[PDB]
Amino acid sequence: GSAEKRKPIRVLSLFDGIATGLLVLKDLGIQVDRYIASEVCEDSITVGMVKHQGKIMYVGDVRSVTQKHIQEWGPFDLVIGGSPCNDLSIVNPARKGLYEGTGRLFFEFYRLLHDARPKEGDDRPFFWLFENVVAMGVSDKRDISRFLESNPVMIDAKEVSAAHRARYFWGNLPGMNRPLASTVNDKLELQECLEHGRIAKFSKVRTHFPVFMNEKEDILWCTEMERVFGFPVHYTDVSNMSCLARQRLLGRSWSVPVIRHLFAPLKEYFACV
Amino acid sequence: AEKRKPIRVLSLFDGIATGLLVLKDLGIQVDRYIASEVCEKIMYVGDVRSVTQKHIQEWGPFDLVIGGSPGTGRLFFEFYRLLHDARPKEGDDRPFFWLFENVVAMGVSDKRDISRFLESNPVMIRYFWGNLPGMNRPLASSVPVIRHLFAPLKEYFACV
Amino acid sequence: GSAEKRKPIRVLSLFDGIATGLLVLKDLGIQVDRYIASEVCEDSITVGMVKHQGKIMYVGDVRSVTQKHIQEWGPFDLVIGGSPCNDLSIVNPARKGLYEGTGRLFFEFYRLLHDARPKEGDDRPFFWLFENVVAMGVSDKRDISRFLESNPVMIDAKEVSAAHRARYFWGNLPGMNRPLASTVNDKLELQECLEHGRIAKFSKVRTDQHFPVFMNEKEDILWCTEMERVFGFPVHYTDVSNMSCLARQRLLGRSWSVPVIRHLFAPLKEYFACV
Amino acid sequence: AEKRKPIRVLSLFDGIATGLLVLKDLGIQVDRYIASEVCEKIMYVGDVRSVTQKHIQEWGPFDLVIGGSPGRLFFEFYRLLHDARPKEGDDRPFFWLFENVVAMGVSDKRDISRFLESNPVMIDARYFWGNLPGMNRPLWSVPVIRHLFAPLKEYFACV
Ligand SMILES: Nc1ncnc2c1ncn2[C@@H]1O[C@H](CSCC[C@H](N)C(=O)O)[C@@H](O)[C@H]1O
Ligand SMILES: Nc1ncnc2c1ncn2[C@@H]1O[C@H](CSCC[C@H](N)C(=O)O)[C@@H](O)[C@H]1O
């Protein structure tokens, strides 16, 4: 209810991956004051380091960030994160649950978020987002929704892309449950993502052989995967990594249109280009 | 800083009323004792999954938070949630103490993670974390135990 | 000496690789009627198929192309080729020479070229280019110059790019020996080709115990996009078909330096239609 | 043609005199016989690597081209063949023979058959490629080359 000039957003991204959050914030025209990312895989760090010109301040393992570090590096306006899910997926029979293995990394989030929340009486806007899979144990989902004191929003990227990708999003972002918008940039069909001379067997990919090329079924190429998930073409064409490693990076990533849908209302809260 | 008042305790301990027995053993007045467990004005509230931040706010304020057992992650993380929910707000210098017990037979990953989250290195006896004057420890390289550890509490709260 | 509207060029590319010739012809603004390429490695075929939208008519092994094929597919205005060199380089001790192994592939060129030149009395313009390595046996170079009835022109990509790449070019292209022009598009230094956050040890790269680039106080080899920039190709030009970065490096190593081929093909604008 | 005229021959054969011996053994008149080897008026011209296309033009026209040995020399023979072939539209008679040993790589046999557009004649054991009538095939050496050259008596003058 008071007057001030809109200021650029200050972001803390845990488990940043290939810097989907910064890409989405840039695409929305939101000015990014600061982008401190916690990422441990060197390939993802190289992707984000190259494709954003060292704007990202990398701090490494999320377990090496202390509350004093949050206070000194802060304040932060947005705290986003997507913890590893190999120990949360019911597909994995050797899963260790939410509290063991790599699932307990979630609590790191729950830690730093509470360290980054404005102190009581501070009416400044503050937003956070935590993404994970839907195919987790019901007990794990209940526990996550208990710790975060929020019920998740189920969003499937098949509605704004050519990928079957349903995910749970906890957070306090404005209107996360609002209906998604299929715009003209959205490539809703797998055929729209293929390179020249390839045909798509299915409308939306579920990652058999999804494409036919000159009477010979193939798998999806890497640039086609970038198009499917909404990333710019050759966005992951850095650092001489194997195609399997690039596929690994792209599979753990966020669907760009989904994150754009989630971040769009932030334009009425921060400076915009 | 008013005159000494009776202590208010929140227990997620594996053995219910262990903390209450230790407190009565030291002769400390108890104004409230809320106990809970993990499963899979002195009250037992059952499953910790049923305890919310609003419940902690209503039953509170709390002065002591105890937890542990004589996977280790679930117990500690429930205890950590309750500790965060019961901790005084920044700028409230009122006394607030906590203790977490576990067995020494735990993965080094678990011990280091617990020490990191609690910002405290453990006391070896079993392993014990706490902020009571006495269990401040540098970097590492039966209820009588809790009695001796809780000894400094009678210097901060009213005794009968 | 007579009048006619200049027509688009008809090209036969043997050992085409990643379609460097078509890329250079397009960049110069020359109109391409048709582009028939003989290539056997499927990675190169996928590169050329994707990055030029299926405009290349692929015919496969050069040894499967007959004189009747050259006649029926023709006429052709430009016959270009760069045969494999692993049996011609002196760096290979197991080299089999020009006449055995993969070196004899050269003669396929010499074959099809003679099947493609206009019959005597046909005053129509007709050009051809054959590229190979400098580090080859002197006897092999003399034999190639004998069979092609032309002395080669030595061109090093270092003069017009950031790569050490000296090659022999036999051909009747107009003014092949003319001085090369260093334009503004040319990235003469390796630093100009590196991605963000990397520093170049040297000024120009060579074809061990040297990691050409420093990155954040660590030694690294050249990235694929940086190799593309070094060789003159567009960025992500070889980012197709899920091939290993080693295979991408192999494709880029065998290729022509784009600015060198542009220098060689420039005078063709005065002979064919230009968009 | 005006009449039967004496033959003109270009020999890259290993053994400079073989072609002339076989030609005189069949009684065929010879206006020109020029022999060359691989190294590395009847006349010897030395290394084939010294023979140019202009030399073939000046010494020519040629009616017969022979090469081989009872290999890198096949490509030299093929160069001389291309240089000696009649221009398009010249239906004058022109013949060639290439001999090699049957002990060759199957790759070499296939490559020679491709380049010469002809399948070879097996003679147990040597391979003979040629366009003489009777050398059409589907998929010392003096007497056999004599019997193979036999059809030359019907295209050139005999003494
Ligand atoms: N201990 C740790 N500290 C910080 N990051 C970690 C970590 N362990 C795993 N990670 C990272 O967390 C990521 C989870 S996958 C999520 C990636 C990101 N949401 C994106 O859109 O790209 C992985 O990329 C992994 O590299
Ligand atoms: N038998 C054959 N028929 C047709 N192409 C062949 C061949 N054997 C090898 N090649 C191709 O010849 C190429 C020689 S390397 C030259 C590539 C090309 N000049 C460029 O600029 O990219 C190789 O890519 C190889 O795939």
Numbering used by the authors:
A (entry chain A): 626 to 832, 847 to 912
B (entry chain F): 628 to 667, 680 to 709, 726 to 780, 792 to 807, 894 to 912
C (entry chain B): 626 to 832, 845 to 912
D (entry chain E): 628 to 667, 680 to 709, 728 to 781, 791 to 805, 893 to 912
Provide the authors' own sentences about this structure as they appear in the paper.
As with WT DNMT3A, the central subunits are well defined, each containing a largely intact TRD and SAH-binding pocket, whereas the corresponding regions are disrupted in the two external subunits. Note that the introduction of the R676K mutation does not lead to an appreciable structural change for its surrounding region, except for an increased distance between site 676 and residue E820′ from the symmetry-related subunit, explaining why the R676K mutation partially reverses the polymerization behavior of DNMT3AR882H and DNMT3AR882C. First, unlike R882 in WT DNMT3A which is conformationally flexible with poor electron density, residues H882 in DNMT3AR882H/R676K and C882 in DNMT3AR882C/R676K are associated with well-defined electron density, suggesting reduced sidechain flexibility. For DNMT3AR882C/R676K, the sidechain sulfhydryl group of residue C882 forms a reciprocal pair of weak hydrogen-bonding interactions with the backbone carbonyl group of residue M880′ from the symmetry-related subunit.
The hotspot DNMT3A mutations at the site of Arg822 (R882) promote polymerization, leading to aberrant DNA methylation that may contribute to the pathogenesis of acute myeloid leukemia (AML). Here, we report the crystal structures of the DNMT3A methyltransferase domain, revealing a molecular basis for its oligomerization behavior distinct to DNMT3B, and the enhanced intermolecular contacts caused by the R882H or R882C mutation.
